[PDB]
Structures are given as structure tokens and as C-alpha cells.
Symmetry: C3
Subunit: 216 residues, 3 copies
């Protein structure tokens, strides 16, 4: 139902210790990246936000993170979900700490929100008060700055992004041009904390508006 939180779920977690040189090469790891933390989940944007949080909570970098084509509901296997993330660190301890922070964030109450009665339209409007090393790299903004992470289905996202950009003094840093692998769209916007918040609120309101009147 409308305004319900869609609960995100982690599906698998594993660790690689003393990563093989052949794999380190293909993943373009740094010399000091000895251990990898692997995670899959059924919600990509929540997991991306969680991985970024992990770079704050632990001595890890996000070295790989990709979404699956057509989304979790179309997964052909049990553990694929719609996202794979890989953290890299100097030791299993740091990688485990990163994965724990990732899990904590995923389970913290964050998630996509339903915009209609049968949850067939959903959106993500998450304000990140200070970016870690992953989302700042991705957005092309300074580490530690705030951002609004805004995602919705393609038309809703374009309409609502326009509403968000007019609601506050924010800049569009990275555009998730539709379709993402999961057939969504969105952007990372940056500005002051209060501006980003204002953008998240306007975005959510605008998605709900389209959902209530798709053909008007």
C-alpha cells in the first residue's frame, strides 16, 4: 500500500582472503587490497548507499558494484538478486567490519517506498548527509558532501527530478539515464544538507503525483 516501506533483503555474503593475483588484476585492485567482501541483495540502490556507508565505517573501498538486468523480480537464480557489491580491504577483519556496516545499513529502515495501492510504483528518496568514498566518486563531488539519492521508474523519475531541481538549490551530479539495468532512472543531486532534504521531499511528492494520475 501507498507509503509502505519495501523491505530490502541481503541474499548472500562471502569473503575472499588472500585474493589470487589473477583476480586482483581483472578487478584492478590496489596492491594493499588483500581481502574481498562479496554481497548480493534484492535492492540495488539501498545496497549502493550501504556500501558507501561501509567506506566510512571500515577501512574498505568499493571496488566493484553492478546491478542485474531486469531487476530482482526477474532473477533466474536464488542469490543473484539485483546487485552485487565487492568491498576490498587489507585484511579479513576490515572486510568483515565493512560487510557488517553494509548489513546494518540495509536493515536500518531505509528502502524504496510504495507510491500506490499495489506497490507497482515505488521510489527511493534518500538524503545522504555525508558521502563516503564510493558515492562521491560516482557523483563526481567532494567526499563528505551531502547528496540526495533519487530513484524511480523512468517517466516518474524524469518528472520528479525536475520537481526536485526546482524545489531547492541543488546540482545534478550524476544522472542515471533510463534504463538502468533494473529499468529505473534517477540522479544524485548535491547541495547543502537542507537543500538535499528539500529535493528528496519534492521528488517523493512528485512521484506520488504521477502515480495518482499517470495519463493526465
Amino acid at each position: 500500500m501507498k507509503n509502505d516501506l519495501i523491505r530490502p533483503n541481503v541474499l548472500s555474503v562471502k569473503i575472499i582472503s588472500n585474493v589470487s593475483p589473477e583476480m586482483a588484476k581483472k578487478l584492478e585492485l590496489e596492491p594493499h587490497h588483500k581481502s574481498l567482501g562479496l554481497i548480493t541483495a534484492d535492492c540495488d540502490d539501498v545496497t549502493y548507499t550501504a556500501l558507501d556507508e561501509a567506506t566510512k565505517a571500515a577501512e574498505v573501498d568499493v571496488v566493484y558494484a553492478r546491478s542485474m538486468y531486469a531487476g530482482a523480480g526477474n532473477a533466474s537464480t536464488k542469490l543473484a538478486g539485483e546487485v552485487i557489491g565487492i568491498l576490498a580491504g587489507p585484511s579479513p577483519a576490515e572486510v568483515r567490519s565493512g560487510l557488517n556496516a553494509t548489513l546494518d545499513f540495509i536493515d536500518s529502515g531505509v528502502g524504496f517506498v510504495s507510491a500506490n495501492e499495489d506497490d507497482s510504483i515505488c521510489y527511493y528518496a534518500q538524503c545522504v548527509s555525508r558521502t563516503g568514498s564510493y558515492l562521491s566518486k560516482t557523483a563526481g563531488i567532494r567526499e563528505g558532501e551531502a547528496l540526495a539519492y533519487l530513484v524511480a521508474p523512468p517517466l516518474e523519475a524524469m518528472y520528479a527530478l525536475d520537481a526536485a531541481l526546482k524545489a531547492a538549490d541543488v546540482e545534478m551530479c550524476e544522472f542515471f539515464a533510463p534504463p538502468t539495468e533494473t529499468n529505473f532512472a534517477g540522479a544524485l543531486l548535491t547541495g547543502s544538507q537542507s537543500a538535499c532534504k528539500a529535493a528528496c521531499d519534492a521528488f517523493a511528492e512528485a512521484v506520488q503525483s504521477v502515480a495518482s494520475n499517470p495519463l493526465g
Copy 2:
């Protein structure tokens, strides 16, 4: 049933009246693009043809047009369908006109055609007599030239494209290499309107022959 038209459906339409400068930047709009028209639908190629038709009826440009992975039947949300299109124009009135032309075309009787009994194989064989500014650009030909717009599932499309190219005096302008986002394939072919129609007819016949005999290669 074979030869049945598969009706295309529009799912969502909205107008942005005064696009924000930030959005205008990431969409790489031109300064004269003040208003956007957004549309999604459950059939990508019909929509692309419709959008191109809109550029003939109004002063709008197709500034964005993309298909969704795995097609409308696999959409995870209500309004995603399998295509999003964005028209840009100088005013909301002009964008509204372009959207109305787009909608009219989508509901004009064009569409994919079934090749078999349960409609599990379908194809698009549409002759565009006079391209607008969108398809001409993507095909790399002058505006106002004719196209055969040919789409089918991957093998059917490769086989039928060969038949189309042999049936008529046409050239391949743009190859939709399998898979497109929707797991189809095909091409835009150009030539005279009559040659394009002949290519459409041959493509159609060839897709149907594969559907009736999918494993036969001897």
C-alpha cells in the same frame, strides 16, 4: 492468432513546462528547448515511429528515446513498459501538439503482428514513407526519405532481413544487432517507398516461415 495485430498501449504521459537548467544540461538540451513531453508505452518500435511522426506535425525534437531491458512483459513497475520517449520544444503548447500526434499514431492501427497461433512470435514490418527528424537521424539519411522498419526476434530477424534485402532494391542503414534491450533485432532499410514496402512484405513472409518451421534448415 497468426496475422492478428498486437495492440500497443500508452502507459503514462506528462509535460514539463519549464525544464530546469540542471536537467537541460544532463539531457544535453539546446537553449531553445524549454519544455519536455514524456511518454512511456508497452511497445518500443511503435513508439519510436510515433515520436518520429510527431516531429513532422510539431516543432519538437526527440531528445531522448530508450527501450527497457527484457521488454514490457518483464516490467517490474506499472508505467515502465518497454520504452521512454522525451520530446523537447519551445513551449508547452508545441509539446502538447507533438504528444497528441504521438498518441494518435500509436492508436492508428500500426503495430506488431502475430506469426503464430498463441502470438508467441511477433514482428514489426512498417513502411515509413517519409521520415521525420528522428528516424532520419538514426538511420543516417536525409529527412523525408523512406524506411522499412523491420523488427523480429533474433533468429527470425536475421533470416528475414536477408529475405528483405533480396526482395527489393534497399540498403541497410541501421542494424539493430541482437539483442536490443527487449531481446529483439532487425534493421532500418532505405530505398523507394515501393522498395521499402516490398522489403516489409518479404520480411513478414520470412518471419512467418520460420515460425511455421523453426528447426528446418535442410
Copy 3:
């Protein structure tokens, strides 16, 4: 159930006897490529392996080979499956011979293997003892050299690739970064035949290990959160 072979199926096969120049150009064919063989199936990596077998059996090259987004289970049409392959040769006879070998290989008993009770996790751990021209070119090795062709879902594949690389004297030739179109991942590894077999064995064991315990981390390391 676990260790069950997943049977691959061919969906469509055709020959273009005399390819048009317009198509030859877009496919970037060689002048001597006069005929095309087309095939679709519901399992991409088995079909790729089969196409490579074709190049050992007849005068054909693999000139096109691509997987479908989100895999065969999400196909929206009857013949799309999850793969299209195109062979090119100098004549219809050679293409027919190539397609024949392709079909035979697909129906030989090769296939993905299930890792759990409901076959919701599967993998491919195929030792190609003698590569044809397609896989050897893909891997950047000489024809006839051995390959381990390893594929599994994304996390399983990353974990199991690391296991495979450590279990034998092999080199990573090609990495299929997750997601491939079908939302899998894997690699082609090369080495001696025995080394490739060891890699295949280690890969299979590692995937089954993840399948049986995908979230062991929670109890071991995530307690008191």
C-alpha cells in the same frame, strides 16, 4: 535436485544460403564467407561451447554470438531463448555440417549442473580439452589448447573463481564480469588438461558450498547487531 544435469534445448536453426552484401557488411564478414548458419537455444554457454565444436568439424567461423537479457526464463518470444549464434562458411554444405556438429554437441549430455534441491542455483564447469577456433580466439590461446569454462551466478562465480585459480596452475584468459546479459558471471581459464580439470572441480565444489550456506556470515560475524 543437487548434481542434476540441466538439459539445454535448441529452439531454432536456419541457413542463409547466399548472404546479401548489405548483411555481410554489417556483420563485417570476410569475402569468402558466403553462407550463414543461425541457431538459438535456451542455454548460452553450452551453445558457445557447441559453436566452438562446430569450428573443429567443418569449414565455419563463429562470426556472431550474443546472449539475451535476463535469460531464457524471461524470454518474451518462443524462439529467442537466451542465445543467438551465427556461423559463416564458404557454402551452404559447410554451414550445414557446422550446424549439425553444433546440434549434436548441445544434445551430447553437456549442461549446467544444479547446486541445490530446487535447481534455483546452477553452474557450468566445463573442461574443454581441445579448443576450436572460436574459444581459442576468445581466450587468446592457440587452437587445441585446453580451457576451463566456468560460469555461475555473480557472487558464487567470484568466490568459486578464486577457489579455482588457487586449486590449479591456470591463468585467467577472459573474465565475464557480473552481470553478463543473463545475469551470470565466470571466466575462461587455461593451462594443462589436468590443471583445467582441477580448476573445474574446485569451481564446482565452491559454488555448491555457497549454495548450501549463502548467509553463514550472519551467525559467525553479524551476531549482536
